[PDB]
């Protein structure tokens, strides 16, 4: 309807974002980024799960890469 | 019309290959010749080379191709290289490109 109130909803926050930043040490499996579209693409030693979710493939440290119109990139550098 | 069919399928198959992260056995083929170049990315670097040009052979372009494959294996295997992935570029795996690849076993392989 109009007045009484037709509004009132909202959904739960999804706690989305970057979970490991540059030069943080990770282990195989650690998810690195939680995100909706392809907003960061998977890099070197980095997986992407069906919900667009990026994880470390290998132990290591995380480096961020901005490739211009190729988008932004997350890799894991071994010395695992 | 921007960015042609050629350059799309071009990128398409490279990108897929480039993920698995092997050494890349790339294949250019002109209407005259057929060349093949084995690359390691992340160093952005060529390792082994083979051409119908620098080998100066001719007649039956396919048969010429099988040769520049064996030519590559032989030179390549000599540096330790055995496993790689076949780039196949913007070419149907068929004919001349098929032939170089099936001439590139006997030597480093899985094609």
């Amino acid at each position: 309807a109009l007045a009484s109130t037709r509004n009132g909803r909202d959904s739960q926050a999804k706690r989305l974002g970057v979970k490991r930043y540059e030069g943080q040490v990770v282990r195989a499996g650690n998810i690195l980024v939680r995100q909706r579209g392809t907003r960061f693409k998977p890099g070197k030693n980095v997986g992407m799960g069906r919900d667009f979710t990026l994880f470390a493939l290998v132990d290591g440290v995380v480096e961020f890469q901005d490739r211009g119109r190729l988008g932004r990139y997350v890799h894991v550098r071994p010395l695992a | 019309a921007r960015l042609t069919a050629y350059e799309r399928r071009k990128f398409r198959v490279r990108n897929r290959i480039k993920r698995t992260g092997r050494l890349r056995l790339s294949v250019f083929r002109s209407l005259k010749h057929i060349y093949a170049q084995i690359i390691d990315d992340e160093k952005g670097v060529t390792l082994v080379s083979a051409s119908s040009l620098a080998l100066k052979l001719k007649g039956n372009k396919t048969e010429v191709a099988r040769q520049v494959g064996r030519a590559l294996a032989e030179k390549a295997l000599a540096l330790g290289i055995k496993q790689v992935a076949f780039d196949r570029g913007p070419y149907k795996y068929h004919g001349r490109v098929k032939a170089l690849a099936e001439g590139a076993r006997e030597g480093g392989l899985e094609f």
Binding site: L2, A3, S4, T5, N7 | -
Partner: protein, 138 residues
């Protein structure tokens, strides 16, 4: 009256009157301006009060520019208390140093005595201005 057609959203949050006019402000169309010394929500009905005072002031003659527009919807409840928002019931946000109005094609002594009338219809203090080098070229 003055009012948009077509809005994207019917109601919209109040927000602040913070700052300086941020553009508008340099006297682009006319010989004389009326500039805002204070912030305020100037109402579609105050604007039209001022516009008419000026045309009445000269001859149906002259030329008048306005140059602020009431695109911000102004809600009010009835004598109720609290359940939802709404309703109704339009303003233009106006910070200091903005040119509203701004006449042309009239004698200075006309424009200035009309712009003086005009600002008596406004909720804020005002300043009459002329035109300059300072109003540049563009």
């Amino acid at each position: 009256m003055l009012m948009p057609r077509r809005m994207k959203y019917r109601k919209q949050q109040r927000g602040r009157l913070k700052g300086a006019t941020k553009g508008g402000d340099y006297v682009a169309f006319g010989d004389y301006g009326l500039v805002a010394l204070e912030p305020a929500w100037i109402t579609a009905q105050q604007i039209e009060a001022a516009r008419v005072a000026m045309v009445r002031h000269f001859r149906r003659g002259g030329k008048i520019f306005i140059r602020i527009f009431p695109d911000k919807p102004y809600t009010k409840k009835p004598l109720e208390v609290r359940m939802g928002k709404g309703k109704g019931n339009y303003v233009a946000v106006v910070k200091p140093g903005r040119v509203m109005f701004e006449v042309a094609g009239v004698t200075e002594e006309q424009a200035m005595e009309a712009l003086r009338i005009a600002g008596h219809k406004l909720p804020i203090k005002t300043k009459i201005v002329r035109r300059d080098a300072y109003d540049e070229a563009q």
